[PDB]
Amino acid sequence: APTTLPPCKGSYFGTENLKSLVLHFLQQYYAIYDSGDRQGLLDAYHDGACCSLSIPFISSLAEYFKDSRNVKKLKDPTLRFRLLKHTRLNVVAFLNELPKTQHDVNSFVVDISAQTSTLLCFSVNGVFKEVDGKSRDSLRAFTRTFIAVPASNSGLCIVNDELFVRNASSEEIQRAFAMPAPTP
């Protein structure tokens, strides 16, 4: 019986072209997302886009509890339906209700996992600080999965967005906040 896990690696982009495209998208997206009014994202989401949020089964995450969607736990089809945000209007209205944020964009670990001429699927792993409200200065970790279609300009248009939010671990916090003096 084996016991070796293969070596874990950072971001997977596949090609230089795609790395450039997705990193620019995330820069642009999160400049709006972290601005204090997210309505600028209306032009990044398809008319028929979907969005949903999930958190760990369990608090400092109370602001995310009302809209969290876990179909393993929640069985009723109507309630399942209602927690899925559909249409760019309902997606971005929901996002603008969430706590204001500052994401560490340049630390994101990004995996591009599917590509065709009509589809790009990539998942983004990172952290954000809450900037205001009851949990001001808290560090959250997250995994966000996007599906995007080519945008009529030259960028990306989001059709599916799944956000998973959790608390950062003590190890994640230590790494994120460290700034020791240099040593040889």
Binding site: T3, G10, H46, N70, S113, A114, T143
Partner: protein, 138 residues
């Protein structure tokens, strides 16, 4: 053409059932796992790309024995503009796994399922997969 709710209900059903089959197979019938993937499917596993059903078969045989505990599942119908003429569902999973010879770990996994009509039941298979440990850099 068809009501959105129909697609949402279909997505939830397909995903919940698929996830139960997937992790049961992973833990207890690993050699059958590759049959749940399309021939062209890929997996990005902690930043490592694995391409094609035959390479997936090899990778799964090489992985240690597993016990997975699944705590969160969410899913969405994928817009037709991204997958023309093809019914697809995005599935997102959070849980923990104990691999033999390794400490227990938390993970997140996402994959896109595609519907394959058949003479009997429609079968859902993975077209693309992504797996990452929460603590992958440790």
């Amino acid at each position: 053409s068809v009501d959105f709710k129909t697609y949402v209900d279909q997505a939830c059903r397909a995903a919940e059932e698929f996830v139960n089959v997937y992790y049961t197979t992973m833990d207890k019938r690993r050699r059958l796992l590759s049959r749940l993937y399309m021939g062209t499917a890929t997996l990005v596993w902690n930043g490592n790309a694995v391409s094609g059903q035959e390479s997936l078969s090899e990778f799964f045989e090489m992985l240690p024995s597993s016990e997975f505990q699944i705590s969160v599942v969410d899913c969405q119908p994928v817009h037709d503009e991204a997958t023309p003429s093809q019914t697809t569902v995005l599935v997102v999973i959070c849980g923990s796994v104990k691999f033999e010879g390794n400490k227990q770990r938390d993970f997140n996994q996402n994959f896109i399922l595609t519907a394959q009509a058949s003479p009997s039941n429609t079968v859902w298979k993975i077209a693309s997969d992504c797996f990452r440990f929460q603590d992958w850099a440790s």
